[PDB]
Design an enzyme around this catalytic site. Structure first.
Site, PDB file in Angstrom:
ATOM      1  N   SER A  45       0.822  -1.205   0.000  1.00 34.28           N
ATOM      2  CA  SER A  45       0.000   0.000   0.000  1.00 34.28           C
ATOM      3  C   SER A  45       0.859   1.260   0.000  1.00 34.28           C
ATOM      4  O   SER A  45       0.449   2.287  -0.551  1.00 34.28           O
ATOM      5  CB  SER A  45      -0.950  -0.008   1.200  1.00 34.28           C
ATOM      6  OG  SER A  45      -1.714   1.186   1.241  1.00 34.28           O
ATOM      7  N   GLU A  48       6.051   1.432  -3.978  1.00 29.48           N
ATOM      8  CA  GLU A  48       7.109   0.527  -4.405  1.00 29.48           C
ATOM      9  C   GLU A  48       8.460   1.133  -4.066  1.00 29.48           C
ATOM     10  O   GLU A  48       8.609   2.355  -4.033  1.00 29.48           O
ATOM     11  CB  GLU A  48       7.009   0.224  -5.904  1.00 29.48           C
ATOM     12  CG  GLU A  48       5.814  -0.614  -6.292  1.00 29.48           C
ATOM     13  CD  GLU A  48       5.645  -0.771  -7.787  1.00 29.48           C
ATOM     14  OE1 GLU A  48       6.109   0.110  -8.531  1.00 29.48           O
ATOM     15  OE2 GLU A  48       5.058  -1.787  -8.217  1.00 29.48           O
ATOM     16  N   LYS A  64      11.716   5.227  -3.230  1.00 24.92           N
ATOM     17  CA  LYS A  64      10.347   4.825  -2.938  1.00 24.92           C
ATOM     18  C   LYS A  64       9.383   5.816  -3.575  1.00 24.92           C
ATOM     19  O   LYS A  64       9.555   7.031  -3.433  1.00 24.92           O
ATOM     20  CB  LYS A  64      10.106   4.754  -1.426  1.00 24.92           C
ATOM     21  CG  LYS A  64       8.636   4.660  -1.038  1.00 24.92           C
ATOM     22  CD  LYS A  64       8.449   4.247   0.414  1.00 24.92           C
ATOM     23  CE  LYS A  64       9.079   5.246   1.368  1.00 24.92           C
ATOM     24  NZ  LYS A  64       8.942   4.812   2.787  1.00 24.92           N
ATOM     25  N   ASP A 158       6.764   3.051  14.805  1.00 29.24           N
ATOM     26  CA  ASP A 158       6.692   1.925  13.881  1.00 29.24           C
ATOM     27  C   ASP A 158       7.987   1.122  13.899  1.00 29.24           C
ATOM     28  O   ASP A 158       8.552   0.817  12.843  1.00 29.24           O
ATOM     29  CB  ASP A 158       6.381   2.414  12.465  1.00 29.24           C
ATOM     30  CG  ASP A 158       5.819   1.315  11.574  1.00 29.24           C
ATOM     31  OD1 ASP A 158       5.538   0.210  12.084  1.00 29.24           O
ATOM     32  OD2 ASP A 158       5.665   1.560  10.359  1.00 29.24           O
ATOM     33  N   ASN A 163      11.230  -2.420   9.389  1.00 28.35           N
ATOM     34  CA  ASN A 163      11.731  -1.052   9.344  1.00 28.35           C
ATOM     35  C   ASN A 163      13.163  -0.932   9.850  1.00 28.35           C
ATOM     36  O   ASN A 163      13.656   0.186  10.015  1.00 28.35           O
ATOM     37  CB  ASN A 163      10.819  -0.118  10.142  1.00 28.35           C
ATOM     38  CG  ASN A 163       9.463   0.056   9.500  1.00 28.35           C
ATOM     39  OD1 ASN A 163       9.283  -0.232   8.317  1.00 28.35           O
ATOM     40  ND2 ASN A 163       8.497   0.535  10.274  1.00 28.35           N
ATOM     41  N   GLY A 178       7.628   7.340   8.162  1.00 29.09           N
ATOM     42  CA  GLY A 178       6.337   7.819   7.705  1.00 29.09           C
ATOM     43  C   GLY A 178       5.328   7.975   8.818  1.00 29.09           C
ATOM     44  O   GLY A 178       4.356   8.718   8.662  1.00 29.09           O
TER      45      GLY A 178
HETATM   46  C1  LIG Z   1      13.157  -4.391   1.655  1.00 23.96           C
HETATM   47  O1  LIG Z   1      13.941  -3.201   1.632  1.00 23.96           O
HETATM   48  C2  LIG Z   1      13.275  -2.010   1.704  1.00 23.96           C
HETATM   49  C3  LIG Z   1      11.909  -1.871   1.853  1.00 23.96           C
HETATM   50  C4  LIG Z   1      11.404  -0.587   1.909  1.00 23.96           C
HETATM   51  N1  LIG Z   1      12.153   0.525   1.833  1.00 23.96           N
HETATM   52  C5  LIG Z   1      13.483   0.392   1.676  1.00 23.96           C
HETATM   53  C6  LIG Z   1      14.370   1.543   1.747  1.00 23.96           C
HETATM   54  C7  LIG Z   1      13.774   2.902   1.905  1.00 23.96           C
HETATM   55  C8  LIG Z   1      13.383   3.578   0.747  1.00 23.96           C
HETATM   56  C9  LIG Z   1      12.818   4.838   0.816  1.00 23.96           C
HETATM   57  C10 LIG Z   1      12.644   5.419   2.045  1.00 23.96           C
HETATM   58  F1  LIG Z   1      12.094   6.651   2.129  1.00 23.96           F
HETATM   59  C11 LIG Z   1      13.015   4.791   3.220  1.00 23.96           C
HETATM   60  N2  LIG Z   1      12.958   5.132   4.530  1.00 23.96           N
HETATM   61  N3  LIG Z   1      13.466   4.145   5.326  1.00 23.96           N
HETATM   62  C12 LIG Z   1      13.842   3.177   4.512  1.00 23.96           C
HETATM   63  C13 LIG Z   1      13.590   3.510   3.162  1.00 23.96           C
HETATM   64  C14 LIG Z   1      15.746   1.348   1.664  1.00 23.96           C
HETATM   65  N4  LIG Z   1      16.620   2.373   1.724  1.00 23.96           N
HETATM   66  C15 LIG Z   1      16.340   0.033   1.499  1.00 23.96           C
HETATM   67  O2  LIG Z   1      17.544  -0.177   1.369  1.00 23.96           O
HETATM   68  N5  LIG Z   1      15.449  -0.991   1.477  1.00 23.96           N
HETATM   69  C16 LIG Z   1      14.078  -0.869   1.617  1.00 23.96           C
END
Ligand SMILES: COc1ccnc2c(-c3ccc(F)c4n[nH]cc34)c(N)c(=O)[nH]c12
Length: 281
Positions: A45, A48, A64, A158, A163, A178
């Protein structure tokens, strides 16, 4: 054609709107033009997350993007709040660094440093209880992040294995801000890791310490945390699950009991834990 707009925040690595490789005349987005995609790190949700190499510096980042365009001003402010939360956290070795954020066509993009696998993925790979040696390292690193967030009146709200992201040489960094709110706005958290006093509307930094205690209990015992019902209440009465708490060192159990103290007034803080002998340097 449409063009991106930088989501400004103190501490960004570039106050320039775009990279020289971006041509605003093409119908492709700034994401498609300034980034060579590699692989999808996760979806849901929340949108990606792609592992990308910039077509500007070739460095590896994680980007993201939100699933659908902005539903409205409240939806836009809710999604943009994660950028502001990253700005309040600042730079810390135990926190995922935000490089730059922008929006285009209603989609919000966040470019962070590329981290390792999530603590959830790492446990799925090993398919068993993580040895206590690694558990202390991730526990210390996450407490370092929480101590940094809580020193600024910020509560993550969270903390869970999904995370926490592995770093080089066994380190890790707290992530996904978030849901972070500043004390002085609050969204639905995960009930599996929810501190018991959040049901009474008592939001404080102590809630993160409880979520980390269940996070450690999940990864160290290879147990699934309940969403509700009787199993949910039993993890919040002060004691530990005798079934799964076996095999844990007495040093780890005592730290778990401290983090899982039901009364938030009596619950240890991140700094108090980091000063324990078991969590030395
Ligand atoms: C399974 O792996 C992941 C799943 C989700 N997110 C990430 C992710 C990331 C992307 C963008 C953001 F704003 C983030 N905030 N905290 C982390 C963040 C990374 N950096 C990362 O390496 N793996 C991620």
């Amino acid at each position: 054609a449409l063009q991106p707009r930088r989501v400004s925040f103190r501490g960004e690595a570039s106050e320039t709107l775009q990279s020289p490789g971006y041509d605003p005349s093409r119908p492709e987005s700034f994401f498609q033009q300034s980034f060579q995609r590699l692989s999808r790190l996760g979806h849901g949700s929340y949108g990606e997350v792609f592992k990308v190499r910039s077509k500007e510096d070739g460095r590896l980042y994680a980007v993201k993007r939100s699933m659908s365009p902005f539903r409205g001003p409240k939806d836009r402010a809710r999604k943009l709040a994660e950028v502001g939360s990253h700005e309040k956290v600042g730079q810390h070795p135990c926190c995922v660094r935000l490089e730059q954020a922008w929006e285009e066509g209603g989609i919000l993009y966040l470019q962070t440093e590329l981290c390792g696998p999530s603590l959830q993925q790492h446990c799925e790979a090993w398919g068993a209880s993580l040895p206590e040696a690694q558990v202390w390292g991730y526990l210390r690193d996450t407490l370092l992040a929480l101590a940094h967030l809580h020193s600024q009146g910020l509560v993550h709200l969270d903390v869970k294995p999904a995370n926490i992201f592995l770093g080089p040489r066994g380190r890790c960094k707290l992530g996904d801000f978030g849901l972070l709110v500043e004390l002085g706005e609050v969204q639905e958290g995960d009930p599996r890791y929810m501190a018991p006093e959040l049901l009474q509307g008592s939001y404080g930094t102590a809630a993160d310490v409880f979520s980390l205690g269940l996070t450690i209990l999940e990864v160290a015992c290879n147990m699934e945390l309940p969403h509700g019902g009787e199993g949910w209440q039993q993890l919040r009465q002060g004691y530990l699950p005798p079934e799964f708490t076996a095999g844990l060192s007495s040093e780890l159990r005592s730290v778990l009991v401290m983090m899982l103290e039901p009364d938030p007034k009596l619950r240890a803080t991140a700094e108090a834990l980091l000063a324990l002998p078991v969590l030395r340097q």
